[PDB]
């Protein structure tokens, strides 16, 4: 929560449509917690049989 490395904090191209681009807190936790978009759906899993 205090590391100064920017690459885990900057906005990545692959977040299009799956994580909200504008909503994030300021302070020391910038870009570390994120909220997911409206229609984004997380999978639950199945068997490859």
């Amino acid at each position: 929560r205090d590391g100064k490395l920017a690459k885990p904090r900057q906005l990545h191209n692959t977040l299009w449509g799956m994580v909200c681009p504008a909503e994030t807190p300021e302070g020391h936790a910038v870009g570390l917690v994120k909220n997911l978009a409206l229609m984004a759906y997380i999978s639950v899993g199945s068997q490859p049989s």
């Binding site: 100064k4 920017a6 900057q10 191209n13 692959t14 299009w16 300021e26 302070g27 910038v30």
Partner: protein, 400 residues
Amino acid sequence: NRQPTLHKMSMMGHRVRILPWSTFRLNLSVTTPYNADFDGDEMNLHLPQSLETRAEIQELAMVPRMIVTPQSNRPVMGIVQDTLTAVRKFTKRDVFLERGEVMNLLMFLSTWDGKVPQPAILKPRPLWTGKQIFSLIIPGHINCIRTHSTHPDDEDSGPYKHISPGDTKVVVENGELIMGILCKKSLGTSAGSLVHISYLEMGHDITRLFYSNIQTVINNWLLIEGHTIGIGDSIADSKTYQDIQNTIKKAKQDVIEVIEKAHNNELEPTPGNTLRQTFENQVNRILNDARDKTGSSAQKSLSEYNNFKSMVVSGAKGSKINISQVIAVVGQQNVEGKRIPFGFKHRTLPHFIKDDYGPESRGFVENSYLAGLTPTEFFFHAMGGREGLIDTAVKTAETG
């Protein structure tokens, strides 16, 4: 004092005055030293208990004794956000006041001797001027020569050097405003200003009255003159829009010729430059010099009644690029000091085709904040804002 104490101006000695409700109340020209603003801020006060400590706080660290700073030998308190815009309009060449309004304004001068000056226009009816009333606020007999922020540099060359059709070249001779409009270059916190000279010559107990009188008189005139900002002040005529469209089209044209002549290996690298480097350098040239003339085309179409130009010219708040960003073009975004990278593989978003190097496909936002942005431009704008938001979070801890 305020939350972080950086320099010795972040802790100064005030004087108590008790009021009904339950917040600390303080003047505005002192918010520059404390670096404060009134959106849920907080400040502490400590009360000297002895009498020796009271005397030393009184003769060492009272706020009128700390107007000029030893860090850069220039004042730290100047006229501020709302009084500056009004002071610029109050000292224009054409501001005439009737009798009742002059009396009402003189009622607010704390250092007035009790005499009413003779009007500048005795017939057909008596009318006072803005500079004629401002000449009563200026203390003692001081002397100063400054310039206004719109002084054409080619004015000292020809004739009218001491006439100044635009009413520039502020001249304060023997303690009275003879000519010129007042702005941040002549009343703010810079070396050689009017407040600096008044502090150097008259002392530390008269500059206090100077500040207070300026503020009270100008506010009580502003509630007659009024001030605002709308969307009529954020829109342009039909001719300017066509010009902006034309120049944008021609720039997007030139970029295409550069690209398609780089695809036939017809580019020659410059000394110390890779081929990618020279390609992107000249496309950045084309894109950057393009938005500038759109900015100038937006500027030269503004009006004298515009309210953006009224806060930019007086130096109260804003810059000359926000005008062009609101009216003409947002410009070109970039992360890490370079163009928008290929976050996907050979793409920026799944809406483009691979290895597209055009302007719109790598961050050039060609709309204005009034016409709104398209989704792909919204995203790139968010990226630029995010990096600009992280840097500030780092800076505070580092410097402290």
